Each structure stands twice: as structure tokens, then as C-alpha cells.
Write a protein that binds this ligand. Sequence first.
Ligand code: BRC
Ligand code: BRC
Lengths: 162, 162
Amino acid sequence: LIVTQTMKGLDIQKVAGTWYSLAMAASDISLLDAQSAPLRVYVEELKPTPEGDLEILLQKWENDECAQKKIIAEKTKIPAVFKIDALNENKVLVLDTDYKKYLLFCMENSAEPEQSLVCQCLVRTPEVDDEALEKFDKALKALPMHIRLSFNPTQLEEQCHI
Amino acid sequence: LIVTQTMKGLDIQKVAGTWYSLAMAASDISLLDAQSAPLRVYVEELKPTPEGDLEILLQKWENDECAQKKIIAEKTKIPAVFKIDALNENKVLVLDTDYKKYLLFCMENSAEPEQSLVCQCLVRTPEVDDEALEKFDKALKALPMHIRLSFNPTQLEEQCHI
Ligand SMILES: O=C(O)CCCCCCCCCCCBr
Ligand SMILES: O=C(O)CCCCCCCCCCCBr
């Protein structure tokens, strides 16, 4: 309830497929700090289940290797909001998407939200889309972000972005 | 020669005194990555010498302590450009400043410049100046930055920003 942008009319079937985490931003430097930072995750594929949920395939640097994790984001009453399971009451929110190029989303804890806010700009191809990054910065100016990372084409094609 | 912004009529005597590194940005994530990242420096004081040079007092996390270093930036033919000494031919450039509130500067190697570009937004008081941060982002949009850090008032008052 910090993000004032949510997408009207989200057809989660159309956001299916391959995605690249072009940019990331968090309210805390320690969330995206190093490669092993807790919320430094790279999205691989989004798979909506027929029930209406969302299977997320991502890569995260855990041990000293690029691990592949599979998270499930269950639907709620609001079509643009999903819930992930743990002691952390995390909510994923889709802010904007044209389905064919980009998708902007934020993640936050429902109790300690502001120290959990982490947002990303996902794009379909391994290219630097300026239009998408502009929109991402636009949605970010109203939020308390303290770190912003951006990756280049070469890094987008590597496991865990090198 | 990547930064297209330099300040006309820089009176380096007026930029004397106390300064806080409110925001930092680099062309490489590894330059500002962790607290011990090579170019993660926090400006304390700027002291212009009568000869026209510039003594820079900064803090950098070296060992496992917040160290205080003293660098000298010698003047060149252009009043807004200074040179620091090492095997690295680094040039400091002052892009804009109103002397009383903020100062924007970038640093780069004259041979491997783009992988050396690191810029900062310095402000006089430990407050989040929106006007200064807007100007900083404006000067940054034309440059290849891949990481952007920002600090809050509480961190600005701590050695090495906590
Ligand atoms: O295993 C972990 O600790 C990391 C969990 C990271 C949560 C990432 C959620 C990504 C959701 C993307 C939704 C795209 Br609509
Ligand atoms: O000792 C080191 O290795 C770090 C050198 C860092 C160079 C910092 C230069 C800061 C210049 C500020 C100028 C303000 Br006009």
C-alpha cells in the first residue's frame, strides 16, 4: 500500500514466457548490494497456471553458484496483486505492462513494507529499451529508492548476469 | 571527454568547506558495489590552496575501518577540470554548483574513461535536497550509468555512511 500504481485489466495469460531483468531498485542498499544480496533475483520465465496463479522461474546467487529457483505467486482478489509464501507476508504488484515489450513490478512485505520495497523492469529481449526505463523511472520517483542497478545486453545473456 | 557538462566561471574559493555525498553513480556496478568498493568515497571537506589546487578530505572503507584520506587535485588550463596523481590519469570535472547548496562532479580515467566514470551529488547540509537530485539525474541521463546509490539524513551524519 505504498505503490500507487497498479495495472487495470491485467491478463496474466499474456505475460507468459521469457523475460529479462533489465533494471532493479530497492528502498535499501543492502537488499541489492552484492551478488549474494537477499533480493538480488533475476527473472527467467513467468508461467501462469490455469487456476490463475503464477509460477516464477528465477536465478539467484546463493552458495557460490548461480542457482535456479521456482517460486509460486498465488492470486488474490485484485487481479494485479499476488502473494508469495513465507514468514514474510510479501505482495507482488504489477504496475504496468504492454505484454509485448516490458513489465514493471514491485515487491514488498505487508508489515515492514518500506524496507522490503524492491522493484524491477522486465523486458522481452536482451536489449536496452529506453522507453521502458523511462517509464520505470517515472513510477519510481514517488517511491523511497536508495539503490538502482541497470544491466547491459552482454550481462543479460549470462547466468546471474555474470 | 565523455561529460558534456562543465561549469563556466568556477570560483574554486567559494566551494570551500563542508560537503556531504548525498548520491553517487558509476558506469560499472563493481565501482560502487559494496562498502569496500574502490571508488566508494565519502567527501568530508574541500580545501582550495592559495596556488589554485584543491585538497580533498574524504572517507573510504579500506581495511575493516572507516579511514580518512587526503587527496590533492591539481589545477589544469580549464578552471573546471582538475587532475589527481597515480598510474591512473584521473580527471575530476565540476559540472554545476550554486556554491551555497550543491555541487555535481564526475571523475574518469583519460584512457579507460567509461569504466572509470563515477559521479556524485554533494550538498552542504545533511538533508535530502530534491532540486539537487533532479539536477544530478538530469546530468546523468546522457551518461552510461549502471548503479546509483542515495543516502538518507541519518547515514549522512555517520562515519562512512554507517
Ligand atoms: O528464495 C528467495 O529467498 C528469494 C525470493 C525472491 C522473490 C522474487 C519474486 C519475483 C516475482 C516476479 C513477479 C513478476 Br509479475
Ligand atoms: O585512495 C583511493 O584509492 C581513492 C581515490 C578516490 C578519488 C576521489 C576523488 C574525489 C574528488 C572530489 C572533488 C570534488 Br570538486
